[PDB]
Amino acid sequence: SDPSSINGGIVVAMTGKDCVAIACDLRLGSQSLGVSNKFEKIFHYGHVFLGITGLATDVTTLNEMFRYKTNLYKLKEERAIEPETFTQLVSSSLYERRFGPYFVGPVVAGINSKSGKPFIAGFDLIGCIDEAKDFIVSGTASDQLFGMCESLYEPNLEPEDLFETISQALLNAADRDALSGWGAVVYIIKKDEVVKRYLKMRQD
Amino acid sequence: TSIMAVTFKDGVILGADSRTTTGAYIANRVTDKLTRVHDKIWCCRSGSAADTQAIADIVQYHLELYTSQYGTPSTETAASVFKELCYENKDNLTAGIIVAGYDDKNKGEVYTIPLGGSVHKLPYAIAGSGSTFIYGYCDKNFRENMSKEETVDFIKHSLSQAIKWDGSSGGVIRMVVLTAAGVERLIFYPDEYEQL
Amino acid sequence: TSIMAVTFKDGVILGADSRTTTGAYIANRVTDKLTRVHDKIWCCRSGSAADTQAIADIVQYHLELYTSQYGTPSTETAASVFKELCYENKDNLTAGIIVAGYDDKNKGEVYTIPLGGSVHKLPYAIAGSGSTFIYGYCDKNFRENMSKEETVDFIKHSLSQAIKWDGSSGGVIRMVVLTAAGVERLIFYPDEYEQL
Amino acid sequence: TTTLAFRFQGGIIVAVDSRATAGNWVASQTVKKVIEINPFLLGTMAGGAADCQFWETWLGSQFRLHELREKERISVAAASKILSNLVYQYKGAGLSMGTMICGYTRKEGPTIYYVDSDGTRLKGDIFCVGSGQTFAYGVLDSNYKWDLSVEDALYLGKRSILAAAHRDAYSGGSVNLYHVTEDGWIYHGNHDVGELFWKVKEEEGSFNNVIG
Amino acid sequence: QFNPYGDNGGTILGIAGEDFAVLAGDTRNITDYSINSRYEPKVFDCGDNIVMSANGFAADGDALVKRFKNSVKWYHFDHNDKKLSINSAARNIQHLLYGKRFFPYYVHTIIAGLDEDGKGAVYSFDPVGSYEREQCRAGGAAASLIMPFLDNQVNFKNQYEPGTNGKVKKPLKYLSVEEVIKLVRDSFTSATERHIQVGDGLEILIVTKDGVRKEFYELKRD
Amino acid sequence: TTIVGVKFNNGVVIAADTRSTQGPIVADKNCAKLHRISPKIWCAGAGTAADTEAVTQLIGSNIELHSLYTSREPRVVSALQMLKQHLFKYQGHIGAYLIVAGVDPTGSHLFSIHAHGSTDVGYYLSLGSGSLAAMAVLESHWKQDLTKEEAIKLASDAIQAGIWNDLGSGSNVDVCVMEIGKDAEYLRNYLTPNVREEKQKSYKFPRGTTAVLKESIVNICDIQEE
Amino acid sequence: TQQPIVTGTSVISMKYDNGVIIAADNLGSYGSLLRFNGVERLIPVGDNTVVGISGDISDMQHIERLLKDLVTENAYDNPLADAEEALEPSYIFEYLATVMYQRRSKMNPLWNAIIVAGVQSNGDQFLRYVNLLGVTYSSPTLATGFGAHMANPLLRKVVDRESDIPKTTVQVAEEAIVNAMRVLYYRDARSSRNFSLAIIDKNTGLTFKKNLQVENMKWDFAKDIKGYGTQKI
Amino acid sequence: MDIILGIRVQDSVILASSKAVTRGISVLKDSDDKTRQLSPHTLMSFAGEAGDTVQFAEYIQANIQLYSIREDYELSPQAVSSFVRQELAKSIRSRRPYQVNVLIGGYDKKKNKPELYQIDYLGTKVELPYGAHGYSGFYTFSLLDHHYRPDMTTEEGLDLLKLCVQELEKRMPMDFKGVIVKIVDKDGIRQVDDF
Amino acid sequence: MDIILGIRVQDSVILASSKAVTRGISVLKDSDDKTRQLSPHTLMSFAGEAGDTVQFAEYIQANIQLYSIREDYELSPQAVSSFVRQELAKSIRSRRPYQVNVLIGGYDKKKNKPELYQIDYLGTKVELPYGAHGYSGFYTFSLLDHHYRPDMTTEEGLDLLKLCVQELEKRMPMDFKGVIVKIVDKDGIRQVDDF
Ligand SMILES: *[B]([O])([O])[C]([C][C]([C])[C])[N]C(=O)[C]([C]C1=[C][C]=[C][C]=[C]1)[N]C(=O)C1=[C]N=[C][C]=N1
Ligand SMILES: *[B]([O])([O])[C]([C][C]([C])[C])[N]C(=O)[C]([C]C1=[C][C]=[C][C]=[C]1)[N]C(=O)C1=[C]N=[C][C]=N1
Ligand SMILES: *[B]([O])([O])[C]([C][C]([C])[C])[N]C(=O)[C]([C]C1=[C][C]=[C][C]=[C]1)[N]C(=O)C1=[C]N=[C][C]=N1
Ligand SMILES: *[B]([O])([O])[C]([C][C]([C])[C])[N]C(=O)[C]([C]C1=[C][C]=[C][C]=[C]1)[N]C(=O)C1=[C]N=[C][C]=N1
Ligand SMILES: [Cl-]
Ligand SMILES: [Cl-]
Ligand SMILES: [Mg+2]
Ligand SMILES: [Mg+2]
Structure with a gap:
């Protein structure tokens, strides 16, 4: 019944020394039934990464929507969109459906290509x-993620150490x-290289 | 319903309208809401007619039995019996009662018992749906140690306004005077009190 | 809320309390419920603050535009504009407004507009949750063609009682005098009006 | 929850998961869903944790009193009926129980009764109970035979719970195995699903859908 | 309509060591968005080297602790001053809880102490009486924030040894009392940051063969 | 949320806490609740966070266009009127509860706005779940003819009352001072009375602690030449 | 199950160096109607305890009778009734707390919030809360209803923790309580100007003050407030 | 309607769909084909509310056939599945949403790979080796988790499908009157007449 | 449970009752006997809410067996049916009523006549030549109205019963996993093991 917890899932993001990390699980279900x-x-649009939790049809719809919008942006602006600008674009796009909203929990992560400054952000539906500054959490286990991040996190972690923490x-x-x-995936993001790692975890 | 009781120099006077309503139909236009639980302890009834009658009947019984054993009860005692019934059966009752009586030792006394079952001793008391419209008037015009004639005028004028504005109130204004002299009944008809 | 408007020999006076409540919390204790839709046409507001403000703002606009085209509007005209909004949007509004104004031809006039959207021209009018407690007092004490000083005393005493008994009413008593002489604002603090 | 039990040549196999949930929150992964009523009787737990624990523990006290009075081991039929008659008294009050009562006696042979808080009492060869019961049924029904070795039967039960642990969101944690024979029950260990899944995948060549 | 239940917030945590056991809990008590008290003790010494806490609805929590303390007193009277073992205390509490199955004590109960071999012990209960011995358990409002941290840092879950890459697990070495108190303090500091009903103060009760000791630490008061 | 506004001798000051909450969880510990409508008109917002932001941006945008159209510095009453009419139209469904303050050619002003569209005038105001704790402080310590220093002290003390006593408020105190004939100073994190203590332990893991299945380089660059 | 009819609002209280202070207004409200203006809601028990009650007034009067009966019962066969075996605040509280939780457990509660203030035999300050649910707690400052939201913040600025109690005099404490009562009159729509205050000191005993009024009110600034935004006249 | 299954093997996609149509208390028909051919190498099975299912399927069929004629080209299974998902994702926020769940089985002639897509009425798309809608998955996924191998032949796929239907016929309460099976491969679509 | 049938012929009464037990989404058992022998020449089949059915049937069984021992005499089918009806008629105004419908098939050894009684959970008794509970009657009564003749043999009764079960298996949505058939005549009660 509750749209935000039919399919399930989580996303988390963190900052480190000259780097950011974003991670998510791989489950899609129909309530108790595990489907995929x-x-x-x-997802990513240029060097800006977007994680989305919540109702899966909206997750897919919004991905396709932000691909659409970032592609038109790039053609007109003649440059890739930055994390700060993209964050504003997500906020705009969600609020236009104020009274008929997408049931999602987006999370933006990336490094500004000009300033080099690490950047993360979260949104409500x-x-x-x-x-x-530190971290963002989203999904059906947001409470659990808040507890883990608040205890495990410290500032200015090196990329390979930040991987272990997140x-x-x-x-x-x-x-x-x-x-x-x-299943689970973790993205480690530096100014001009991005490593993607699939994690081995319990399959229940 | 518009009911009130007022203490004065020589004792206490009870006052009431005579209207009983089933919705907007006046089921009885000449009702007597001033009822007797003892020789010189009376009460004013508001709320459910069935509940307040059943309660009043039980109190009259309790005070009749008290008298047979321990002699004349105080007005405080009568109020306590009313309370005990109203409080312990608050879930199932809809009764707003004013108890008034005259002792020789304590003179005129007035106790009001609203829905909850709480007791409040006061110089005067007002109750019933029509009482809302005369809080302002009664507060401005009540004095302690009034005369009989002044107290009758105070109640007559007060209930006249309550009747004028409240649809649930109307008919004749009944009153009952309680003093050392005895028990006097008064009645005031529409032609008299409407022109005030 | 306790609001009233009273016509007298030299014109009309508007009166109001200053309490705004969200349940039992007083969200504003120094509210101004006497608001201006034209130079010498004011109104008293009760009910929803948002609704009565939105309405008053629209009326002020309509009368400002009326003035630019046809000159000074009558108080009857102002009441009609209030009515048109309240009646045609009765389903979505909760507003109880009293319109009062001073012409030279018509002198002091008072129109009351309850929830439905009906209009009633009266010598004086009372409204708001606290008005229930002063129907008796106001009816007994109102006279036509009173003086300024008498009318101020009538409103001051009336609202004092309404404040005393109504939890939704309180704070300072604001008043606005409308005569040929002009527009005068009056204020009366708790220490003054409580001891009455 | 996923719990199963089935009759075969070498007696009865009982297998259960370990997960307990409150909504989507995983409350416990180490729950003991098999009750050791006596050296010959086992009870499975599904539904309300408290209802099942309390009344199946109570249940052992009634049986102990039976054999003290009658100088004889209680039958699985009588055992299961004590529980079913008890919950039937509480019917409507809101008890939530899905249970198997499993055992072995000389007169009955290996016996399994399904007992239910609606009052349902059913004798049978195979039962699966819980939110993940349908998943376990798939593996059991396609691989079940009467002529199974104790080794093969134990694995089938273990594998059926694993199947349900994977797909059912409200099942998981670990697998507890029991084997019930002529001479009583024998515990066959706690098996963590986090390790068992990868082991089974590699050796069995199953779960080709998942990446490892 | 009258609602006989309420929610007083709070959070509690029990950890079992090799020869000791701790039971912690914050000292804040609340209704809705108001603080009732910044110091209202929640974990209690019940005698026989047993500590207890019943978190959730405080009226039911106090009632239950009171009735268990009573049970310990009568256990001594009826059975010749015999020490009530932790496992026996647990089973007794099950019956207290299930006794009100159809009008439950709205609490999450945890007890801690030592078992009969001297090893540390923690038991955990749901509102209607189901119970289980555990090495680690957080209960109450911020239980969802704390438990995952304890799975990771007490039971070394999802942790492996460097160089082997997922093949060899991190060995389950035992934790000292100083090491456990560090994890308890960090758990509550972290919970206070992200849960509005947790704060003010932290009170820990440590249980050893020598008896029951107390330690108190300040928490953020916002 | 605790937000306040306090008038003083030569202007007006507003303040706010920095806690955002979803149910009993804290979503953001250092949230920014002071919004800029124009350079010298700022407002503090309570209620639904997306709404207070959106309605401020929209009105702030139209105010800017109006300022350019009229060649005049914007007025607080203009922002007030545009906000109330917008909110009234949406019959309360846009959950924005605002304290609007600022200085303009008319003078210094302080108003409040509620979601249904009702406005109120005052020398001191407070909104949100911690308004009762804040208003208690304001009612005890407010006087006429406050100085700038006194008004900042009173305003931040009212927010602190909210921070400590209300569970819907916490963390830091943000302030914005708007004096007549001066630039508005926005004091972000004016007070920081809620720094977390050092942890007992470091939770930095040994490298290789997490099990991995696959690795791969992600192509973030565009299609290449040659 | 019932609904409260005639109701009483905030009760506020705090500790200080040598004792405790408690206060509550004299109003009995009937919904929005401010029906009864002479209701005493602080009820002393002996010379060492004061019980302040809010909520349903009929239930208050019942509790009042229970306490009156408790004093009578304690005197029975008790030569030390006015000395070593006199009723302690802690005894009176625990009795009420028992009754409140029993009544909620029969789904027929006494619709009240109660604060028991007093001083013990050994001079220790006693202050504890209990309500219709049987929920109990203690704190250097305690308040019910609106007092919880508005009084506690003000009182906690004087005594923020335990160590602030010896540093707080009776003069400073009474000042804070009286101020809190003024603030409640400004902001609670079901409060009155008239109130009662009680002090229980370990040296000077029980002082019970009746017919107090809220004074030194600020209203003069109201005259300058006009309209709701744009209006100037 | 009730049960619809799908499985992707080495060189083909196999869809199985029940034959029963039950309206209330009686089974009005026991030979119903719950599928439509969208293009020569793409088949869509469906299940949901009465009326909506066929109306939606034929509406999609018409649109894909229109595309085929216009461009003289067959869309990829991936492209068709994305079109279908968008129509359902549009539908879910309509006045009266389409209450239909589908499986899309197709053979991509460009990549020479079979492809199976599962889409629900909300517009939730996933590519899978094997899939199901409704209560079917609760019984069948455990079997497929055990037996499936990516490199199974079509004959091996049909045997694994028989094992799934046998389990359903054993444990499901509703009599679904068997299934119609269809194979999608490089040569097109064909029906297995004996099952 | 689901389907229970009954038919009275020349010299016997035949009861047919389904084997399936479904709790929710799965069929926990496919060999359940929904009947109890009350006495040597009296059989009672039952269907209703879970738990209540067996509890009620065994309670009746115990009472009739107690009567048999006490009097050393078998009650008539008419007498047993009246006892059962009263228990259900008492039950319907209880705190928690028995939610059970029954068919009582018996052979009266005094009158040498077979007798079939149909009783619902309210305590509504009727003697019939053929009867059914639940949705079963909606399909089967039309066939029995056509074919039943009151002088049929037991073999003819079984054939007419097969025609009823075939229709149910064709038109009912629920798979009831076949029926267990039992015959009640002068020689007692026996089960037809092949049906
Ligand atoms: B009075 O209006 O409260 C009146 C007093 C009663 C003692 C005679 N009550 C009634 O008339 C009640 C209805 C009612 C009106 C207003 C407030 C509360 C109750 N009427 C009856 O009880 C009644 C009506 N018709 C027949 C019998 N009883
Ligand atoms: B008065 O009490 O009717 C008053 C008049 C208003 C114009 C200021 N109304 C209110 O205070 C209303 C509530 C109300 C009380 C009694 C009757 C009807 C309505 N309050 C509000 O509209 C309000 C409260 N808090 C914030 C914003 N608006
Ligand atoms: B199992 O899922 O039925 C499981 C078995 C139980 C004995 C541990 N039950 C639970 O996990 C239930 C919730 C539930 C989930 C799915 C179906 C039915 C019930 N949980 C509890 O009873 C419970 C007890 N204590 C704490 C948390 N949850
Ligand atoms: B304050 O507590 O009023 C605060 C002010 C806001 C501008 C930051 N409000 C919130 O934090 C609201 C409370 C709320 C919760 C649930 C529904 C509506 C309002 N929270 C949010 O707006 C919020 C919650 N989670 C994520 C993002 N925003
Ligand atoms: Cl009468
Ligand atoms: Cl207003
Ligand atoms: Mg009348
Ligand atoms: Mg029948």
């Missing part, structure tokens, strides 16, 4: 921007949620 273990929730935050949060898990 290959449903990735992180209707557009409100949460621009945290991976352990996701994995242990997912294992305390019935509608999350079934």
